[PDB]
């Protein structure tokens, strides 16, 4: 069966982690696995493999110190593991097998930063009336001052089909920060109801926030 | 041990079209692989012994790979096939991983609607105030972006994030930002932002000077 990694993981710099990878009660021992990282536009670095059977380590020189890695003969799990990282560390890691093949995992992403779970401060965007010479003008929700991903918009909740672009998050002073923008006729908003769904799974917030002009 | 190298690192390519990008190495090597992410989620399965083909690979492809230059070459371009690619090597000692070739669609060149939005309520209630540009479903890539407090060209402070190829609409946007206090914003007026695109090199911008 296809690789097995956890949810999504988050860390204070300087410290350690343990991240699996699970797989069948069978096809287990017998297969060369690897570890790898690649951080958000990343290339491919490829750290070292491990042996089930034996049990035998292989890292790449310049993580032998970073980097360890094991398993667990039993519980069909191949736990690589990392200590003492840095917001440059910060990345996402996949382990995977195969001869010539590959076929590998939901690979899994790690968070060196240093703040908590910060609620979102939650602003809307509306032009210089008209500023935007436009038949349809521009709208959205400014979501700054947060740190735990993700975040999620809808506008008037899911109501919202198209022309709604929302963007990546921009983390930066350890705080995520996104903006996303939805567009309408000068038929719409200019009198329509349009609240913005802004969310968070963390604070666990639905900030739902309306929008009209007049600043 | 052994770096690869991808060819052109981005490439823009309508469909039909042949195109053909390419690794090349530190090393005589033995057979070459190439996989494919598509953004965010991990690489697939792609191409393995220099020109052996994993299955579900559409047929548009071919492995090139001489001992130490290596092509990778789509015949007719479609949609899908729109990604982005690298190469490993297997037999280095530590096995390592190409550059990373990015495809994507050439379009009909489109220009940008160009949003920006005063700082809110709110914000000022907080000081450090903000201000976007959003410039939306517009192609090819080519973007100099740039603001202009008081006309003043201004280097630092903004904050750029940008989506690929809309699935539906089959172009870019980028949200940019802008930021202080209050203060040292109170400071310079004509708060304005311009961007620039390879069609329309006579330059089109959304301004702003309230009060």
């Known amino acids: 069966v296809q690789l097995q990694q956890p949810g999504a993981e988050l860390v204070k710099p300087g410290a350690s982690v343990k991240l699996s990878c699970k797989a069948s009660?069978?096809?287990?021992?017998?297969?060369?696995m690897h570890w790898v990282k690649q951080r958000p536009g990343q290339g491919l670095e490829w750290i070292g493999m491990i042996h089930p059977h034996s049990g035998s380590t292989n890292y790449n020189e310049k993580f032998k110190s970073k980097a360890t890695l094991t398993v667990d003969k039993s519980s069909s799990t191949a736990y690589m593991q990392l200590s003492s990282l840095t917001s440059e560390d910060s990345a996402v890691y996949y382990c995977?097998?195969?001869?010539?093949?590959?076929?590998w995992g939901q690979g899994t992403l790690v968070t060196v930063s240093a703040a908590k779970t910060t609620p979102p401060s939650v602003y809307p965007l509306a032009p210089g009336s008209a500023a935007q010479t436009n038949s349809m003008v521009t709208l959205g929700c400014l979501v700054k001052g947060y740190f735990p991903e993700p975040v999620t918009v809808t506008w008037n909740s899911g109501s919202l089909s198209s022309g709604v672009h929302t963007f990546p998050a921009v983390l930066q002073s350890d705080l995520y920060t996104l903006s996303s923008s939805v567009t309408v006729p000068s038929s719409t908003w200019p009198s329509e109801t349009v609240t913005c769904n802004v969310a968070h799974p963390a604070s666990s917030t639905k900030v739902d926030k309306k929008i009209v002009p007049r600043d | 041990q052994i770096v690869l190298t991808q060819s052109p690192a981005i490439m823009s390519a309508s469909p039909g079209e042949k195109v053909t990008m390419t690794c090349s190495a530190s090393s005589s090597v033995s057979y070459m692989h190439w996989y494919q992410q598509k953004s965010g989620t991990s690489p697939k399965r792609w191409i393995y012994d220099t020109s052996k083909l994993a299955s579900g690979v559409p047929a548009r492809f071919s492995g090139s790979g001489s001992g130490t230059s290596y092509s990778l070459t789509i015949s007719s371009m479609e949609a899908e096939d729109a990604a982005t690619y690298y190469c490993q090597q297997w037999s280095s000692n530590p096995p390592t991983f190409g550059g990373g070739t990015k495809l994507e669609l050439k379009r009909a060149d489109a220009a940008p609607t160009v949003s920006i939005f005063p700082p809110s309520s709110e914000q000022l209630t907080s000081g450090g105030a903000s201000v976007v540009c959003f410039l939306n479903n517009f192609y090819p890539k080519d973007i100099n972006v740039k603001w202009k407090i008081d006309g003043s060209e201004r280097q630092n402070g903004v904050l750029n994030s940008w989506t690929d190829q809309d699935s539906k609409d089959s172009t870019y946007s980028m949200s940019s930002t802008l930021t202080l206090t209050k203060d040292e914003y109170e400071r310079h007026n004509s708060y304005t932002c311009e961007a620039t695109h390879k069609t329309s090199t006579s330059p089109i911008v959304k301004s702003f000077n309230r009060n």
């Open positions: 995977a097998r195969g001869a010539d093949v590959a076929y």
């Open positions: 009660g069978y096809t287990f021992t017998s297969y060369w």
